[PDB]
Short mmCIF file of C-alpha atoms and ligand atoms in Angstrom, two decimals:
data_model
loop_
_atom_site.label_atom_id
_atom_site.label_comp_id
_atom_site.label_asym_id
_atom_site.label_seq_id
_atom_site.Cartn_x
_atom_site.Cartn_y
_atom_site.Cartn_z
CA UNK A 1 -39.20 16.96 66.27
CA UNK A 2 -42.72 16.99 67.78
CA UNK A 3 -44.25 20.33 68.63
CA UNK A 4 -43.87 21.29 72.29
CA UNK A 5 -47.40 22.62 72.76
CA UNK A 6 -46.78 23.93 76.26
CA UNK A 7 -43.82 25.96 75.02
CA UNK A 8 -45.92 27.33 72.14
CA UNK A 9 -48.65 28.32 74.61
CA UNK A 10 -46.03 30.13 76.71
CA UNK A 11 -44.95 32.03 73.59
CA UNK A 12 -48.55 33.09 72.85
CA UNK A 13 -48.87 34.31 76.46
CA UNK A 14 -45.55 36.22 76.25
CA UNK A 15 -46.64 37.89 73.00
CA UNK A 16 -50.04 38.79 74.48
CA UNK A 17 -48.44 40.34 77.57
CA UNK A 18 -46.03 42.28 75.34
CA UNK A 19 -48.96 43.58 73.27
CA UNK A 20 -50.83 44.51 76.48
CA UNK A 21 -47.79 46.53 77.59
CA UNK A 22 -47.99 48.43 74.28
CA UNK A 23 -51.69 49.13 74.85
CA UNK A 24 -50.97 50.44 78.37
CA UNK A 25 -48.15 52.65 77.04
CA UNK A 26 -49.92 54.11 73.99
CA UNK A 27 -53.68 53.61 74.27
CA UNK A 28 -54.69 53.26 77.93
CA UNK A 29 -58.48 53.53 78.27
CA UNK A 30 -58.83 54.01 74.52
CA UNK A 31 -60.72 51.79 72.12
CA UNK A 32 -57.94 50.47 69.85
CA UNK A 33 -54.19 50.77 69.51
CA UNK A 34 -52.61 51.66 66.17
CA UNK A 35 -49.38 49.74 66.86
CA UNK A 36 -47.24 50.99 63.94
CA UNK A 37 -47.66 54.69 64.80
CA UNK A 38 -48.09 54.00 68.53
CA UNK A 39 -51.35 55.93 68.77
CA UNK A 40 -54.99 55.15 69.59
CA UNK A 41 -58.33 55.38 67.80
CA UNK A 42 -61.98 55.38 68.79
CA UNK A 43 -64.36 52.59 67.75
CA UNK A 44 -67.97 53.27 68.82
CA UNK A 45 -68.14 57.05 69.18
CA UNK A 46 -65.41 59.30 67.75
CA UNK A 47 -63.65 61.06 70.60
CA UNK A 48 -65.58 59.20 73.32
CA UNK A 49 -63.68 55.98 73.80
CA UNK A 50 -65.07 53.19 75.99
CA UNK A 51 -61.88 51.21 76.69
CA UNK A 52 -62.90 48.68 74.03
CA UNK A 53 -59.66 46.68 73.65
CA UNK A 54 -59.11 46.67 77.41
CA UNK A 55 -62.58 45.19 77.93
CA UNK A 56 -62.12 42.67 75.09
CA UNK A 57 -58.79 41.50 76.55
CA UNK A 58 -60.01 40.80 80.09
CA UNK A 59 -61.10 37.17 79.87
CA UNK A 60 -58.03 36.32 77.75
CA UNK A 61 -55.74 37.84 80.39
CA UNK A 62 -57.40 35.82 83.16
CA UNK A 63 -57.28 32.55 81.20
CA UNK A 64 -53.55 33.08 80.57
CA UNK A 65 -52.84 33.71 84.26
CA UNK A 66 -51.86 37.33 83.55
CA UNK A 67 -53.52 38.22 86.84
CA UNK A 68 -51.91 41.59 87.55
CA UNK A 69 -52.81 42.76 84.03
CA UNK A 70 -56.37 41.41 84.37
CA UNK A 71 -56.85 43.21 87.66
CA UNK A 72 -55.43 46.47 86.26
CA UNK A 73 -58.03 46.28 83.50
CA UNK A 74 -60.89 45.36 85.84
CA UNK A 75 -59.93 48.20 88.18
CA UNK A 76 -59.92 50.67 85.25
CA UNK A 77 -63.43 49.51 84.26
CA UNK A 78 -64.74 49.88 87.79
CA UNK A 79 -63.35 53.40 88.21
CA UNK A 80 -63.96 54.77 84.71
CA UNK A 81 -66.35 52.94 82.40
CA UNK A 82 -69.76 54.61 81.97
CA UNK A 83 -72.35 54.23 79.22
CA UNK A 84 -74.33 57.39 79.99
CA UNK A 85 -73.11 58.95 76.74
CA UNK A 86 -75.00 61.20 74.28
CA UNK A 87 -73.82 59.37 71.17
CA UNK A 88 -74.85 56.59 68.79
CA UNK A 89 -73.53 53.06 69.26
CA UNK A 90 -74.00 50.16 66.88
CA UNK A 91 -76.17 47.71 68.84
CA UNK A 92 -74.62 44.50 67.46
CA UNK A 93 -71.00 45.52 68.07
CA UNK A 94 -71.79 46.97 71.50
CA UNK A 95 -73.40 43.70 72.59
CA UNK A 96 -70.84 41.22 71.30
CA UNK A 97 -67.80 43.28 72.35
CA UNK A 98 -68.76 45.24 75.50
CA UNK A 99 -71.71 43.34 77.02
CA UNK A 100 -70.00 40.04 76.26
CA UNK A 101 -66.55 41.24 77.37
CA UNK A 102 -67.91 42.46 80.70
CA UNK A 103 -69.84 39.20 81.19
CA UNK A 104 -66.79 36.97 80.62
CA UNK A 105 -64.72 39.15 82.97
CA UNK A 106 -67.53 38.92 85.54
CA UNK A 107 -67.71 35.14 85.26
CA UNK A 108 -63.91 34.82 85.66
CA UNK A 109 -63.65 37.15 88.67
CA UNK A 110 -67.03 37.09 90.38
CA UNK A 111 -66.91 40.90 90.65
CA UNK A 112 -70.50 42.23 90.85
CA UNK A 113 -69.58 45.60 89.36
CA UNK A 114 -68.78 43.97 86.03
CA UNK A 115 -72.26 42.39 85.92
CA UNK A 116 -73.87 45.71 86.94
CA UNK A 117 -72.14 47.42 84.01
CA UNK A 118 -73.03 44.66 81.53
CA UNK A 119 -76.65 44.91 82.61
CA UNK A 120 -76.70 48.73 82.44
CA UNK A 121 -75.42 48.51 78.88
CA UNK A 122 -77.91 45.80 77.89
CA UNK A 123 -80.75 48.00 79.20
CA UNK A 124 -79.54 50.82 76.93
CA UNK A 125 -79.47 48.40 73.98
CA UNK A 126 -82.95 47.11 74.83
CA UNK A 127 -84.37 50.44 73.65
CA UNK A 128 -83.37 49.49 70.07
CA UNK A 129 -85.54 46.33 70.27
CA UNK A 130 -88.42 48.21 71.92
CA UNK A 131 -88.46 50.72 69.02
CA UNK A 132 -89.64 47.94 66.65
CA UNK A 133 -93.18 46.51 66.79
CA UNK A 134 -91.56 43.16 65.84
CA UNK A 135 -88.83 43.32 68.47
CA UNK A 136 -86.18 43.51 65.72
CA UNK A 137 -83.45 45.88 66.93
CA UNK A 138 -82.60 49.03 65.04
CA UNK A 139 -78.90 49.09 64.15
CA UNK A 140 -77.89 52.15 66.20
CA UNK A 141 -79.05 53.56 69.52
CA UNK A 142 -78.10 56.66 71.47
CA UNK A 143 -76.73 55.27 74.75
CA UNK A 144 -78.17 58.17 76.81
CA UNK A 145 -81.43 59.06 75.06
CA UNK A 146 -82.59 55.81 73.47
CA UNK A 147 -83.05 57.43 70.05
CA UNK A 148 -82.69 54.89 67.24
CA UNK A 149 -81.38 55.04 63.70
CA UNK A 150 -81.08 52.75 60.68
CA UNK A 151 -83.69 49.95 60.61
CA UNK A 152 -82.28 48.37 57.43
CA UNK A 153 -80.58 45.56 59.26
CA UNK A 154 -79.56 41.93 58.82
CA UNK A 155 -79.70 38.52 60.48
CA UNK A 156 -76.38 38.93 62.32
CA UNK A 157 -77.42 42.33 63.69
CA UNK A 158 -80.87 41.11 64.83
CA UNK A 159 -79.75 37.65 65.99
CA UNK A 160 -76.41 37.83 67.83
CA UNK A 161 -77.70 38.63 71.33
CA UNK A 162 -79.17 35.46 72.82
CA UNK A 163 -75.93 34.18 74.37
CA UNK A 164 -75.07 37.40 76.24
CA UNK A 165 -78.71 38.26 76.98
CA UNK A 166 -79.47 34.69 78.07
CA UNK A 167 -76.50 34.70 80.45
CA UNK A 168 -77.78 38.05 81.80
CA UNK A 169 -81.15 36.40 82.42
CA UNK A 170 -79.53 33.47 84.25
CA UNK A 171 -77.36 35.71 86.44
CA UNK A 172 -79.95 38.42 87.19
CA UNK A 173 -83.07 36.24 87.38
CA UNK A 174 -84.84 38.53 84.89
CA UNK A 175 -86.08 36.57 81.88
CA UNK A 176 -86.75 39.70 79.83
CA UNK A 177 -83.25 39.66 78.22
CA UNK A 178 -83.47 36.06 76.99
CA UNK A 179 -87.02 36.64 75.76
CA UNK A 180 -86.14 39.81 73.85
CA UNK A 181 -83.25 38.15 72.04
CA UNK A 182 -85.15 34.95 71.20
CA UNK A 183 -88.20 36.86 69.88
CA UNK A 184 -86.10 38.60 67.21
CA UNK A 185 -84.66 35.27 66.00
CA UNK A 186 -88.09 33.59 65.90
CA UNK A 187 -89.34 36.44 63.67
CA UNK A 188 -86.99 35.64 60.82
CA UNK A 189 -87.14 31.86 61.30
CA UNK A 190 -90.92 32.07 60.88
CA UNK A 191 -90.26 33.68 57.47
CA UNK A 192 -88.07 30.86 56.14
CA UNK A 193 -88.85 29.91 52.56
CA UNK A 194 -90.12 26.50 51.50
CA UNK A 195 -86.46 25.44 51.06
CA UNK A 196 -85.65 26.46 54.64
CA UNK A 197 -83.60 29.61 54.03
CA UNK A 198 -83.87 33.22 55.22
CA UNK A 199 -82.68 36.25 53.29
CA UNK A 200 -79.84 38.01 55.12
CA UNK A 201 -81.34 41.53 54.98
CA UNK A 202 -84.36 42.45 57.10
CA UNK A 203 -86.20 45.68 57.96
CA UNK A 204 -86.77 46.33 61.67
CA UNK A 205 -90.03 48.25 61.11
CA UNK A 206 -91.75 46.41 58.27
CA UNK A 207 -90.45 43.04 59.51
CA UNK A 208 -89.93 42.02 55.86
CA UNK A 209 -86.84 40.84 54.05
CA UNK A 210 -85.18 43.59 52.00
CA UNK A 211 -83.15 41.31 49.70
CA UNK A 212 -83.53 37.83 48.27
CA UNK A 213 -80.01 36.64 49.22
CA UNK A 214 -79.55 33.80 51.68
CA UNK A 215 -76.03 33.73 53.08
CA UNK A 216 -73.87 31.89 55.61
CA UNK A 217 -71.41 34.79 55.49
CA UNK A 218 -71.12 38.41 56.68
CA UNK A 219 -74.47 39.91 57.80
CA UNK A 220 -75.88 36.44 58.56
CA UNK A 221 -73.20 34.12 60.06
CA UNK A 222 -73.49 34.51 63.84
CA UNK A 223 -77.31 34.17 63.81
CA UNK A 224 -76.71 30.50 62.97
CA UNK A 225 -74.08 30.13 65.70
CA UNK A 226 -76.36 31.61 68.33
CA UNK A 227 -79.11 29.08 67.58
CA UNK A 228 -76.74 26.24 68.50
CA UNK A 229 -75.15 28.18 71.31
CA UNK A 230 -78.54 28.78 72.97
CA UNK A 231 -79.15 25.02 72.98
CA UNK A 232 -75.70 24.49 74.49
CA UNK A 233 -75.94 27.26 77.11
CA UNK A 234 -79.65 27.23 78.00
CA UNK A 235 -81.03 23.89 76.85
CA UNK A 236 -83.45 25.71 74.55
CA UNK A 237 -85.23 23.08 72.48
CA UNK A 238 -86.52 25.52 69.84
CA UNK A 239 -82.98 26.72 69.17
CA UNK A 240 -81.62 23.15 68.99
CA UNK A 241 -84.22 22.35 66.31
CA UNK A 242 -83.71 25.61 64.44
CA UNK A 243 -79.90 25.28 64.41
CA UNK A 244 -79.99 21.89 62.71
CA UNK A 245 -82.83 22.82 60.33
CA UNK A 246 -81.01 25.94 59.17
CA UNK A 247 -77.69 24.16 58.64
CA UNK A 248 -79.23 21.28 56.78
CA UNK A 249 -81.04 23.77 54.44
CA UNK A 250 -77.67 25.47 53.82
CA UNK A 251 -76.00 22.13 53.10
CA UNK A 252 -78.81 21.24 50.66
CA UNK A 253 -78.97 24.56 48.78
CA UNK A 254 -75.77 26.56 49.38
CA UNK A 255 -73.03 23.91 49.46
CA UNK A 256 -71.35 24.05 46.03
CA UNK A 257 -68.03 22.70 44.82
CA UNK A 258 -65.66 24.69 42.62
CA UNK A 259 -62.38 23.14 41.47
CA UNK A 260 -62.92 20.30 43.93
CA UNK A 261 -63.34 22.54 47.00
CA UNK A 262 -66.44 23.21 49.10
CA UNK A 263 -67.82 26.77 49.25
CA UNK A 264 -71.14 28.32 50.33
CA UNK A 265 -72.00 31.15 47.94
CA UNK A 266 -75.13 33.26 48.37
CA UNK A 267 -78.30 31.95 46.77
CA UNK A 268 -81.84 33.16 46.19
CA UNK A 269 -83.57 32.26 49.45
CA UNK A 270 -86.62 30.81 47.65
CA UNK A 271 -85.28 29.37 44.40
CA UNK A 272 -81.75 28.32 45.37
CA UNK A 273 -80.26 29.98 42.27
CA UNK A 274 -76.70 31.13 42.95
CA UNK A 275 -76.63 34.92 43.40
CA UNK A 276 -72.99 35.56 44.25
CA UNK A 277 -69.45 34.39 43.70
CA UNK A 278 -67.69 35.87 46.77
CA UNK A 279 -66.76 34.25 50.07
CA UNK A 280 -65.18 36.22 52.91
CA UNK A 281 -62.51 34.95 55.27
CA UNK A 282 -65.05 35.35 58.07
CA UNK A 283 -67.09 32.42 56.74
CA UNK A 284 -64.46 30.07 58.20
CA UNK A 285 -66.47 30.14 61.47
CA UNK A 286 -68.95 27.85 59.72
CA UNK A 287 -66.50 24.93 59.57
CA UNK A 288 -66.61 24.87 63.38
CA UNK A 289 -70.40 25.34 63.57
CA UNK A 290 -70.86 22.40 61.17
CA UNK A 291 -68.90 20.22 63.61
CA UNK A 292 -70.84 21.50 66.61
CA UNK A 293 -74.25 20.65 65.13
CA UNK A 294 -73.22 17.09 64.21
CA UNK A 295 -71.94 17.67 60.65
CA UNK A 296 -68.21 17.17 61.35
CA UNK A 297 -67.23 15.59 58.01
CA UNK A 298 -68.77 18.55 56.18
CA UNK A 299 -67.09 20.95 58.63
CA UNK A 300 -63.70 19.39 57.94
CA UNK A 301 -64.36 19.62 54.18
CA UNK A 302 -65.09 23.34 54.55
CA UNK A 303 -62.07 23.90 56.82
CA UNK A 304 -59.96 22.35 54.03
CA UNK A 305 -61.03 25.16 51.68
CA UNK A 306 -59.54 27.71 54.10
CA UNK A 307 -56.48 25.53 54.73
CA UNK A 308 -55.92 25.74 50.94
CA UNK A 309 -56.13 29.54 51.12
CA UNK A 310 -53.63 29.64 54.01
CA UNK A 311 -51.17 27.29 52.26
CA UNK A 312 -51.45 29.21 48.98
CA UNK A 313 -51.57 32.84 50.15
CA UNK A 314 -49.97 32.65 53.63
CA UNK A 315 -52.66 34.88 55.13
CA UNK A 316 -56.21 33.94 54.17
CA UNK A 317 -57.51 36.62 51.76
CA UNK A 318 -60.21 38.87 53.19
CA UNK A 319 -62.47 37.84 50.29
CA UNK A 320 -62.11 35.35 47.44
CA UNK A 321 -63.95 34.54 44.23
CA UNK A 322 -65.20 30.96 44.73
CA UNK A 323 -65.15 30.29 40.98
CA UNK A 324 -61.38 30.82 40.76
CA UNK A 325 -60.17 30.37 44.33
CA UNK A 326 -58.26 33.68 44.06
CA UNK A 327 -58.26 36.91 46.18
CA UNK A 328 -60.76 39.72 45.57
CA UNK A 329 -59.08 42.05 48.08
CA UNK A 330 -55.43 42.54 49.15
CA UNK A 331 -55.92 44.08 52.61
CA UNK A 332 -56.90 42.22 55.77
CA UNK A 333 -58.57 42.76 59.10
CA UNK A 334 -56.15 40.59 61.19
CA UNK A 335 -58.99 38.11 61.24
CA UNK A 336 -59.58 35.28 63.77
CA UNK A 337 -62.07 32.91 62.12
CA UNK A 338 -59.61 30.18 61.03
CA UNK A 339 -58.31 29.41 64.58
CA UNK A 340 -61.96 29.84 65.73
CA UNK A 341 -62.90 26.88 63.53
CA UNK A 342 -59.78 24.94 64.55
CA UNK A 343 -60.60 25.29 68.26
CA UNK A 344 -64.27 24.39 67.80
CA UNK A 345 -63.45 21.25 65.79
CA UNK A 346 -60.61 20.29 68.18
CA UNK A 347 -62.99 20.42 71.15
CA UNK A 348 -64.89 17.46 69.61
CA UNK A 349 -62.11 14.77 69.74
CA UNK A 350 -58.83 16.62 70.37
CA UNK A 351 -57.41 15.70 66.97
CA UNK A 352 -53.79 17.01 66.81
CA UNK A 353 -54.31 18.04 63.18
CA UNK A 354 -56.19 21.15 64.36
CA UNK A 355 -53.26 22.16 66.58
CA UNK A 356 -50.90 21.77 63.61
CA UNK A 357 -53.08 24.02 61.43
CA UNK A 358 -53.55 26.66 64.15
CA UNK A 359 -49.78 26.72 64.78
CA UNK A 360 -49.23 27.59 61.11
CA UNK A 361 -51.76 30.42 61.53
CA UNK A 362 -50.14 31.77 64.71
CA UNK A 363 -46.66 31.65 63.21
CA UNK A 364 -47.93 33.43 60.09
CA UNK A 365 -49.46 36.15 62.27
CA UNK A 366 -46.05 36.62 63.92
CA UNK A 367 -44.33 36.70 60.50
CA UNK A 368 -46.67 39.31 58.97
CA UNK A 369 -48.53 41.43 61.56
CA UNK A 370 -45.97 42.19 64.27
CA UNK A 371 -45.33 45.92 64.65
CA UNK A 372 -43.51 48.18 67.09
CA UNK A 373 -46.25 48.31 69.74
CA UNK A 374 -48.46 45.30 68.96
CA UNK A 375 -50.10 43.44 66.09
CA UNK A 376 -51.65 45.06 63.04
CA UNK A 377 -54.01 44.47 60.13
CA UNK A 378 -52.44 44.25 56.67
CA UNK A 379 -52.42 46.54 53.65
CA UNK A 380 -51.37 44.05 50.96
CA UNK A 381 -50.92 40.29 51.29
CA UNK A 382 -49.49 40.08 47.75
CA UNK A 383 -46.24 42.05 48.34
CA UNK A 384 -43.16 40.45 49.87
CA UNK A 385 -42.94 41.39 52.65
CA UNK A 386 -46.66 41.91 53.08
CA UNK A 387 -47.31 45.58 53.73
CA UNK A 388 -49.04 46.69 56.93
CA UNK A 389 -51.85 49.02 57.79
CA UNK A 390 -51.92 50.53 61.32
CA UNK A 391 -54.64 49.10 63.54
CA UNK A 392 -55.07 46.31 66.08
CA UNK A 393 -58.81 45.48 65.92
CA UNK A 394 -60.51 45.07 69.31
CA UNK A 395 -61.46 41.48 68.47
CA UNK A 396 -57.78 40.43 68.35
CA UNK A 397 -57.68 40.87 72.15
CA UNK A 398 -60.62 38.50 72.72
CA UNK A 399 -60.29 36.02 69.83
CA UNK A 400 -57.22 34.57 68.15
CA UNK A 401 -54.71 34.83 71.01
CA UNK A 402 -57.30 33.14 73.24
CA UNK A 403 -57.95 30.48 70.56
CA UNK A 404 -54.24 29.71 70.19
CA UNK A 405 -53.77 29.62 73.95
CA UNK A 406 -56.78 27.35 74.51
CA UNK A 407 -55.54 25.02 71.74
CA UNK A 408 -51.98 24.80 73.07
CA UNK A 409 -52.02 25.32 76.85
CA UNK A 410 -54.37 22.70 78.33
CA UNK A 411 -54.80 25.30 81.04
CA UNK A 412 -56.30 24.17 84.38
CA UNK A 413 -58.19 27.51 84.47
CA UNK A 414 -60.73 26.17 81.95
CA UNK A 415 -63.05 23.15 82.16
CA UNK A 416 -62.71 22.22 78.50
CA UNK A 417 -65.81 19.99 78.62
CA UNK A 418 -67.98 22.93 79.76
CA UNK A 419 -66.26 25.67 77.72
CA UNK A 420 -68.64 27.90 75.76
CA UNK A 421 -67.50 30.84 73.63
CA UNK A 422 -69.50 33.72 72.17
CA UNK A 423 -68.98 34.84 68.55
CA UNK A 424 -66.41 37.34 69.98
CA UNK A 425 -64.77 34.44 71.92
CA UNK A 426 -66.05 35.70 75.27
CA UNK A 427 -66.09 32.73 77.61
CA UNK A 428 -69.65 32.32 78.89
CA UNK A 429 -69.16 28.96 80.65
CA UNK A 430 -66.21 26.87 81.79
CA UNK A 431 -64.07 28.99 84.10
CA UNK A 432 -62.37 26.99 86.88
CA UNK A 433 -61.39 29.45 89.54
CA UNK A 434 -58.02 29.12 91.27
C1 LIG B 1 -68.92 43.56 58.93
O1 LIG B 1 -68.66 42.24 59.44
C2 LIG B 1 -68.87 42.15 60.83
O2 LIG B 1 -70.19 42.55 61.18
C3 LIG B 1 -71.22 41.76 60.56
C4 LIG B 1 -72.54 42.38 60.98
O3 LIG B 1 -72.56 43.73 60.49
C5 LIG B 1 -71.09 40.30 60.99
O4 LIG B 1 -72.06 39.54 60.27
C6 LIG B 1 -69.68 39.80 60.67
O5 LIG B 1 -69.51 38.47 61.16
C7 LIG B 1 -68.59 40.71 61.27
S1 LIG B 1 -68.51 40.69 63.08
C8 LIG B 1 -67.60 39.15 63.41
O6 LIG B 1 -66.22 39.17 63.05
C9 LIG B 1 -65.30 39.92 63.87
C10 LIG B 1 -63.93 39.30 63.62
O7 LIG B 1 -63.59 39.22 62.24
C11 LIG B 1 -65.63 39.86 65.37
O8 LIG B 1 -66.25 41.08 65.77
C12 LIG B 1 -66.54 38.67 65.68
O9 LIG B 1 -65.90 37.43 65.35
C13 LIG B 1 -67.84 38.79 64.91
O10 LIG B 1 -68.52 37.55 65.04
CA1 CA B 2 -67.35 35.42 65.14
CA1 CA B 3 -69.12 29.67 67.70
NA1 NA B 4 -63.08 39.10 75.91
#
């Protein structure tokens, strides 16, 4: 019997609404729900929540036609959400989750207050860039005072701003946001080695690399996405060039096969010698990026490595040893990168194979992570049943439920040909208002 995709989309929507009801009941205005205990936790600043999961959920709610829920969230933001807070926030997370979540909600609704708040927050983050003579942001900034801390940063945390900041520039008319984000990326690209790689670790004050490890994985990953995404969103010719150059250097020097499967271990950024044996689950994003930049066959080959992990382990292990293809960790973060890749590859030619693979992933989420008041990260994927931890990460609200729904629903609320997603799955182009 063929899959009824519209029925599966309706199930995703029903589950998302049910989870939202749990958030309203147990964690209203709080950063994250802990859906096993039915409690909440803070994310950015302990004891000073910023409605994180509410903000992350907004564009998903709108796309699903959960309009009353969307409006309840928007109305909470407009009455309550302030960033004039004497506490330290991690610049990268604050941008991709809160700036991006407010921007997607603004684009869906047209509500100027959501743009005002996104821009206020971006101006607070700008102080972290201004505190470096290179324009490389410090990792943490005090939202009220502008004081910075921790300049020992990385490509992801200096280079995952251009989509949100560039959209701010388009909407506001002020080019400063785009320019600030692009300058930080150019800095590290100008320090590529002769083999075209950057080390992942960079110092905001010296402007120098602080390791020799090139990576496609955690601490690097979304830099490479945002090069392509800036071409797609803004027509930026430098970023188009840089995206393809970086990926082809990675394919030349980091693509390695182990037991017949493609992986991308870390390598010395100058010599290409392999310097690690781990790959995280989060690297699955790269299968989709490979397709986006015109390397679809290679993207499908990399997706197949993660499809192997899903078929073998049920849930993709949080980290594996590439030399054995086995888990290095037993816990998970309820991670979204596999359906991320499936959606991105599916947007190319609508191949039903990607729907089939994402349906496995959704059903496995239901079979493993469902708790009393929502969906939770896992303690141990090796027990039967898999044991649960007690946390719904904020990204769940923006990412995998949206990915599943976009893959299955063919919703008229999205122009699929114009759809653009941030690394947190915030929709930055493609809304079709009702
Ligand atoms: C620790 O891993 C996170 O942060 C580093 C930067 O410190 C990133 O390089 C890494 O990709 C993730 S954030 C990444 O994954 C999340 C979902 O698993 C989500 O916030 C979003 O997809 C983000 O791109
Ligand atoms: Ca991501
Ligand atoms: Ca992407
Ligand atoms: Na969102």
